[PDB]
Design a protein around this ligand. Structure first.
Ligand SMILES: Cc1cc(C)n(-c2ncc(Cl)c(Nc3ccc4c(c3)n(CCC(C)(C)O)c(=O)n4C)n2)n1
Ligand SMILES: Cc1cc(C)n(-c2ncc(Cl)c(Nc3ccc4c(c3)n(CCC(C)(C)O)c(=O)n4C)n2)n1
Lengths: 5, 125, 125, 5
């Protein structure tokens, strides 16, 4: 997996 | 919202599961006929990948057909290679099939595939 | 074949087009009812994202239903957040909704979402 | 985009 898009 | 988190691999994981449904013939809703060769698929995946299929399945009469016949000039192997690309992101482009794949992608209105075929042909000239 | 080329953005581009079909209500084939709140969707996308929907739509009797009623304990906002995640890879996780989102993802058998919810709750403890 | 996977 999870990221800041 | 502006505060969403994003799972990087989600879209690829969804496409793999859609290809698994195609392989097991689960909830397929159309047969595409190419010179007496038949291919089962999901209308939604075809529409997401092709300008021609988007136009066909948004038509108020054609949206209800369970069989679609393609132009007799279309090559069945070229169509098969493009259907596999739709469900996997992988294109089996070879010297022996590139002309048939490019012609089929032009008919199906698949812009990125047409562009790459043109570049690979230009390199061999 | 072993010689395939791959278009990196293809899977994400397909998912965006499936979400556009959902937004325009094109070829949606099921209504999910959550405590009298109704949500229209495509069975194939639901099956690709959820172990519960995979089991439901592979059943020889349930595969033919156009309406599916969820357990009355399920929160409509939690379901809405998860349906948006299915079609976009983006999860709107907030302090005020995390408990309802985790409970809904456990019921829907969405393993990656459950795991992330657990990690975000553990960090606040 | 296109790559060798
Ligand atoms: C605002 C907007 C713009 C588009 C393209 N929209 C669209 N919505 C839904 C669908 Cl199913 C869909 N279909 C579709 C239609 C035409 C396409 C196409 C997909 N594709 C495939 C493109 C990707 C995958 C990026 O290769 C082409 O090449 N053309 C010409 N398109 N909506
Ligand atoms: C060999 C094999 C293994 C799987 C999982 N297969 C499968 N095929 C087709 C579908 Cl539609 C599908 N469905 C599905 C089923 C169970 C799931 C699931 C999707 N998902 C979502 C997973 C991703 C997106 C990676 O988040 C869960 O979390 N579970 C438990 N699964 N086939």
């Amino acid at each position: 997996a999870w990221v800041i898009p | 919202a502006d505060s969403c988190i994003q799972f990087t691999r989600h879209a690829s994981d969804v496409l793999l599961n859609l290809n698994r449904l195609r392989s097991r013939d689960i909830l397929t809703d159309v047969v595409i006929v190419v010179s007496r060769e038949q291919f089962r698929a999901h209308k939604t995946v075809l529409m997401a990948c092709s300008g021609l299929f988007y136009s066909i399945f948004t038509d108020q009469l054609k949206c209800n057909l369970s069989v679609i016949n393609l132009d007799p000039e279309i090559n069945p192997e070229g169509f098969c290679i493009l259907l596999d690309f739709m469900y996997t992101s992988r294109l089996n482009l070879r010297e022996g099939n590139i002309m048939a794949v490019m012609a089929t992608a032009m008919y199906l209105q698949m812009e990125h595939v047409v562009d790459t075929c043109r570049k690979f042909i230009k390199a061999s000239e």
